[PDB]
Ligand binder design. Sequence first.
Ligand code: 6ZY
Ligand code: 6ZY
Ligand code: CL
Ligand code: CL
Ligand code: CL
Ligand code: CL
Ligand code: YB
Ligand code: YB
Ligand code: YB
Ligand code: YB
Lengths: 494, 494, 494, 494
Amino acid sequence: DLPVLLTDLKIQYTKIFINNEWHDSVSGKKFPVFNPATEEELCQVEEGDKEDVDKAVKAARQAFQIGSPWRTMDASERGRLLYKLADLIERDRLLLATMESMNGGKLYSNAYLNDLAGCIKTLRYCAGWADKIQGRTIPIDGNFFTYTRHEPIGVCGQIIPWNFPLVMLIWKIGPALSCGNTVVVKPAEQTPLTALHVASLIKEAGFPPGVVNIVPGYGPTAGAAISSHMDIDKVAFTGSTEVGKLIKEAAGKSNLKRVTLELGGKSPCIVLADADLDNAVEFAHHGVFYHQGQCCIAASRIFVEESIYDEFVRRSVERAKKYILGNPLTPGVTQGPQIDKEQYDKILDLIESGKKEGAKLECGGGPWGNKGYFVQPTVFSNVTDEMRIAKEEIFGPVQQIMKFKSLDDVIKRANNTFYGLSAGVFTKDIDKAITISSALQAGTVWVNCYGVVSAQCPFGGFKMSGNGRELGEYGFHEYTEVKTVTVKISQKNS
Amino acid sequence: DLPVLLTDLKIQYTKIFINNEWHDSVSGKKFPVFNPATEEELCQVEEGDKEDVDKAVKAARQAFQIGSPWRTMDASERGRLLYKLADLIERDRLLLATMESMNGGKLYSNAYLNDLAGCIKTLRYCAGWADKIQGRTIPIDGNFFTYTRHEPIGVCGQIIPWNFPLVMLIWKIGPALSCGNTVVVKPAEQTPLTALHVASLIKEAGFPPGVVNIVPGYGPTAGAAISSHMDIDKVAFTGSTEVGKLIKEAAGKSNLKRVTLELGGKSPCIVLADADLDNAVEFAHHGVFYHQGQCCIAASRIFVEESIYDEFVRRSVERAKKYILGNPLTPGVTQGPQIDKEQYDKILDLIESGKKEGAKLECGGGPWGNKGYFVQPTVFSNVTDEMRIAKEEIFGPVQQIMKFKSLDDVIKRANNTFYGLSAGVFTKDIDKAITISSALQAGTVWVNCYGVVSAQCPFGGFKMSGNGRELGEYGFHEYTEVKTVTVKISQKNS
Amino acid sequence: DLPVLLTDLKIQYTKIFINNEWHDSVSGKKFPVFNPATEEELCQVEEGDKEDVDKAVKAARQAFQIGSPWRTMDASERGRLLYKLADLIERDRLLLATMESMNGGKLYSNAYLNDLAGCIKTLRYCAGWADKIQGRTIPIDGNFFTYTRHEPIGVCGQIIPWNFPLVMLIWKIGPALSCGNTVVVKPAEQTPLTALHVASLIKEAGFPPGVVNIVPGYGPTAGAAISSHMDIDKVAFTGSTEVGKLIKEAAGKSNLKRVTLELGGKSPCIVLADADLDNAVEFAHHGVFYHQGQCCIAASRIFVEESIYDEFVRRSVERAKKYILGNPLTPGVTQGPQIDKEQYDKILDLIESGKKEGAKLECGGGPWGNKGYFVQPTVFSNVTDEMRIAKEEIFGPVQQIMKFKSLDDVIKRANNTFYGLSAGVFTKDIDKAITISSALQAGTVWVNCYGVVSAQCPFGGFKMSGNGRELGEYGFHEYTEVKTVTVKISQKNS
Amino acid sequence: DLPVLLTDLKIQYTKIFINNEWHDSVSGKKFPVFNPATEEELCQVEEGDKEDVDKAVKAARQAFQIGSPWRTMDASERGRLLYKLADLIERDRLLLATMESMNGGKLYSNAYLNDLAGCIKTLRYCAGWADKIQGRTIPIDGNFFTYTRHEPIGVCGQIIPWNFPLVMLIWKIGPALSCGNTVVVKPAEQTPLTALHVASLIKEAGFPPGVVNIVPGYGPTAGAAISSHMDIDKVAFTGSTEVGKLIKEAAGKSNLKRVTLELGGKSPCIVLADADLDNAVEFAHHGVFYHQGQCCIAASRIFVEESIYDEFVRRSVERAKKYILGNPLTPGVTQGPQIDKEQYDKILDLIESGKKEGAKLECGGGPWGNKGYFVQPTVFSNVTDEMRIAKEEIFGPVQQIMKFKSLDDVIKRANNTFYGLSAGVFTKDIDKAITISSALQAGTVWVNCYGVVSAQCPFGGFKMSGNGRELGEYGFHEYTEVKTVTVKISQKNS
Ligand SMILES: Cc1oc2cc3oc(=O)c(CCC(=O)N4CCCCC4)c(C)c3cc2c1C
Ligand SMILES: Cc1oc2cc3oc(=O)c(CCC(=O)N4CCCCC4)c(C)c3cc2c1C
Ligand SMILES: [Cl-]
Ligand SMILES: [Cl-]
Ligand SMILES: [Cl-]
Ligand SMILES: [Cl-]
Ligand SMILES: [Yb+3]
Ligand SMILES: [Yb+3]
Ligand SMILES: [Yb+3]
Ligand SMILES: [Yb+3]
């Protein structure tokens, strides 16, 4: 069932969302928003700056004050509001998926069946945690009653990437709100639109004003304002490792706000000679090519044992040669455009090093079409470890395939990167599955699969791929602040 | 390193232990204690009855009173006392292992290297939980502050089996004391001695009087007194499923005391054709023959895929034919006696059905020696499911080996019992390991091993093999009683 | 907002619910169901017996089989089904509240505003736990990978009381289903009707057939069948302590099925001289008189410090003299009838001992009306501890008020009962609040309030008031069965 | 019992500790270490630099490698090593307390009875967690088996302050080692000595080489090397908020290493008119004057309700006038010196603003003695909020006392700081205790006490007083790195 919108899409929500009302930018300036597939302007959106971030934080700060409706309402009712928001997003599933496909260059079937289903499901998961966040009672030494409160932190700045605008909006706001925080959200400059629609739905659902504020605009302007703000308690960011470093620096120099980062990767797969070959090819393929290669977990280094390497490469190239490039919205189309020019350029430049540095180009290797930021799906075999394409996150439809003979050595190669977001292990051997996945320095390790993400699981990076975890029981910790209360008593009893 | 006691062992502690002092039985009666390997009396021990159980409970009840030293001491200090007790048992390791070997018919190497090492390690594990037992603070609906206390339950009656007297004493008292309970312990009539020594060490370590009381004697007398007592809050029992039913009945009819039971099993292994054959033979063998077959987890039904069945049986019989029967204390001896006549008889009677009902007797099948309750190690192949030896817990050195062709069907056969304590799965296939172990109705499932027990793991039965779990984080729950405290407040804030 | 049903109520659902279809009793026999307020027959309902319990268990057993839709569906989808069921009950709130009021003699405002709101809220709470039930990974000694599964137990027999038919149905089925169990439910003989409606809604919501089965009928027939059944894994019961003992006995004698009991109480309040007097009077009053005194937590012994005792009694009597007895359905009416004749009789007989044994009767003390099981609200002062009304659970609108001078002594009196479900402490002193609530042998202790129950809190009894806890995080444990899986590995790494 | 060392103390350990051997600095340079009470050189210690930090990290990195003894040993054995280390520190309690008193200017009774008792107890607490750190098994959507490993992070850089050298060494190394990390420790330049002794005891206890490495030297040299190091996974620091900001900046700019900070405070107490006056005076006094005022939790703003303010100040001044200044080692002496000149100067300069800005000087207000960094205990009343002494952390023996009439307003004043480490609330009113402690933006809130710290409790700051928590169950999270493993399976069952 892939249903579509009967009527053409209208853009309605284009303004800054503060205290559940729509504001013009303080400057009165606006910025254009484009369709990556056509390069055509879709609309203009109010451009947020430091000055508008300041109005947004004051609102969030006020909504967080002791005695406010958001602080005093039952935790179960915070949960209710989140499940209501999920019902509303479900109601507008067609609209939101179309806007996502059109604004983000995302295949409509994926937008409809995966992104929107993931938004709704993650929101419902998070709603369920709200009244299940608990502290402890603790048998402290001495005559004292000690307990802990796992309080909300406060005003959380949240910077959302362009690759999954809806899903990452919900990954951020779901846990933050479930825990009782207020938020100031900065959607990606490329993709502000679906966040602004969701904001209209946060108002409709009845969240108190100031609990969620959305400020579109640029990273170097509105993003830096958030990251350096003296009354924002925490920043959450997903994006490049480079910008990740700036945020952590800015937090340190400003007010020591808490920081969680989900950054890039150069995620490896190790395919043992005993693996289900077809299964490893299929998962490794979709693992690196999903959403035009624009996933932080891109399986961008595939290590295959020598005796099956040739056969793996062949089957891989075959699968890569089956795509149909075009408008995300057209049925049958199986690959959309890259998000924008900056990205488009870096990917072509990286594809060019592949050749110069002397990888074996099996298919693809250039642009496609007359308009839109389309890159041909590309496969390099015989890649080696000092090559740019083997070290640098491409964030493009470009697969690297290498050979290995020694398991000891391939694990060292797999781990020999500053990244560490994810990895895959393909084998039928129980002992190898357990021991290899233990030895990989990666936040998520898939065995005989790839790219399996769900709300029930914590997700995040080792090393420079990130700090902290999102989702699962564990992810919920990073939106709480623990307070210990210790009360003098005449005499304790166990 | 198997060191031994330089001097002959002296029996010192033979009396009822209450309030850290030694008491004669109220009747003044005594009962004999024997060496299973010689049938010779070792000593006389004071015989505990209802009347002595009553003195023991009053002491435990008094030691549990609000404001007592055990109730008011720091949880960390309960932990200290437990780690001290472990240091003391370590000091007397040679003595205790010898007494265990001599009184329980247990091989000295196993007693020294396994039982005593397990006592010490489990005690130290439990000591570490004492100040880490925590309640919660809870975001209740309405204007209320709600917290929970995970209190000790109170006076816990604990009936210890004869097969692992020291280890099961520590399994019971470690968690109970760690949580702040007081205990009345009833060691097995066959094996009171090592418990009485440990009691001398509980006094030495400085536990407050009445926190641990030990009352030797019989099950139908002192056991029934415990199980029916109106001021005992909980009963823990390990033993036969038959007696297990009586305890639960008696608890219901008396004061609805809490009940945890660890009972027998008829635990199955499923060996797939792809398994490491030598490894499965070795683990399945030791799995059923450990401590003269006298383990509740005895791997007493081994299902082997047809194409490796003949080879499995052969290798099995070979291993079973390597034992040396004799005095547990003599070095080189690899199989001791059964614990007593009642047991000895049931095992021979079950071995006799094996033959009549028409299993293939591969080796063993009768008694051994002139004195001592020695049974030849016995192996039956071609066993089928309606046979007594395939349905009834033997608790003797008797292995059953069956064949299967269908995985669906063998799992149904594996699950077709009222027992469910443990199982083993031998295979190299990842999917099968996970899916079979999920489908088995067994409390502990070993994959490519058997009989792996540690303090960090919860342990207990599905179905009529028991109620509740011992050890691990989870086992600690069954020695707490949760109290919710809900306080009216003017206004709550998250 | 107390809205009502525009149209008269029609009874539709009156049959045994198995595999999502309606069955006649195997006997073909039926039993009458009455209105306690009129003594008039409301309808006939199919009478369930052992034979119909057997059909119900086979269905539940089949729905629990490995590979079934209930076993294999995502945990998140079990949660979805539960939130859907809550939406449906919300839709039929008017209908269900009317049926509850009419069948159970329950005040309609309470039924509508409290019982139904509690059903919906508890169901939504439970839905949220479904995909948050987690086992552990454990750092076992040796070279092993060990994890635990917190599996559903299996087929759970659930016996629901008549005092809160809807709320207790949801307390039982919510957690059981959330955890993945299947259930066979036995609603109270007096109050089968609202359960049968909910069953129609379980079918509508799309639970797989056999996941919930409802079998109305009698306790000594269908109840005993459940409690003694050889293929029911667990029994949950709420009711009298007397019947509680029978169930635990029957479980022991049959198949050692797991047992949780929530039984009566004789719950005490301790009111210190420093307490907010009006607040303690109001909470203690509603604490004992709620739902015609028919709560297990009835605050049926109120201990008041001497210097405020006279003033407490006066204010109490005044509040008790304000009721309006009548049909639960009529607006303005503030006290309905007792549930039936058996109950009615025991309450009058207990009121009669109050007089003979020589308490001071302040108001009430006899029946009311010409039809219906109405008892005048009754207040006894100068009650002492050996009086029947001070020892026996009345389960009627009868308040006992006593005096105390010594805090040490009143706590001993408060604790001097075989019951221990709940207690109240009224004081402004921080130290006293904490120390008294610690010293009370009661499962829930309210401070400066009473009768505050919410889904987020575990609830259950100390002593003969019950075994186990319901609701909260902790209550969810008693619907899981823990399985430890231990896998041999070549080498572990931390 | 305050026992002392019979023999004079000898300094033995003065070198850099790497791979359980003693190294000279790579430069060959050394730095002097002083006695704050005499200003006399105690000894010379090897001066660590970037170059020696590099040798220390390579050792820690090697000791962390997959397959090493520290990675492969049982978690229970990591615990054993920690309990052994605690036994050793207990053995050398006299020695270590003397060295602490002499090197750190710390009163010997406090060093012996508090610091050393806290070291031993915290170590034993941490040992107990080692084999109780557990991941989860998770009911992920789809046909997958998902589990998590809570792995050690890796090489942890740990910078220890001078105010509690032993206690903070154990706060850092206890949890880090318990979790399986390796460490590179940088003791304070002022106080390297007791860490070097503990290192000799880490070698004696048998930790594997490279698991703990200690590198003395300066903050701007060895500290910055740690904070900017490209192969250190995490930095933990306790100290000034100013240096705290530099570390977080340096971590961001280098390798995005994880950061936990425990920084200063300007911690407030709120004393209600209903409080136990003597109790609040005593706790607030010791709260600000403990260890010459050199605690991060110094109760450095005491807000007292107007009607008891005069009486509070009087009683306070009286208590402050009872000290005896002198050598920490001399019995009877009740106040030692400040740690050094830099500190001494800042404190006198802050005392000088107190006067100029116009607080009421009640006692003290200048230096003391001819040698040693002694400051007279100082009390300022009538302090207001814009005063330096009311905004700036003094870290000296200087108490500020203010008045308030409005509870709303005093809470705003209490919260009106960038700090937020701790607070105190003194009252007898239950509701106020709960509501005020909820409203305070402080990591630890004491009610009717102050400065109550124990291993069982998490401890750390809100706002610029720190990021993260140390100790308790919760603190253990910040020394783990969570890895999710998701395995494809044919079919899952709940
Ligand atoms: C190859 C191989 O197979 C084996 C099979 C085993 O089978 C067992 O039953 C046991 C005893 C387990 C135990 O500790 N118990 C006391 C606690 C309750 C259960 C019994 C051991 C130690 C065991 C060891 C090995 C080795 C080595
Ligand atoms: C001032 C004041 O006193 C009160 C006293 C009360 O006493 C009760 O017993 C109850 C019923 C609690 C309940 O939900 N039950 C169903 C679940 C099992 C236990 C019974 C309520 C709602 C209650 C409310 C108030 C208010 C308001
Ligand atoms: Cl906590
Ligand atoms: Cl709890
Ligand atoms: Cl578990
Ligand atoms: Cl986790
Ligand atoms: Yb172009
Ligand atoms: Yb004989
Ligand atoms: Yb009548
Ligand atoms: Yb000087």
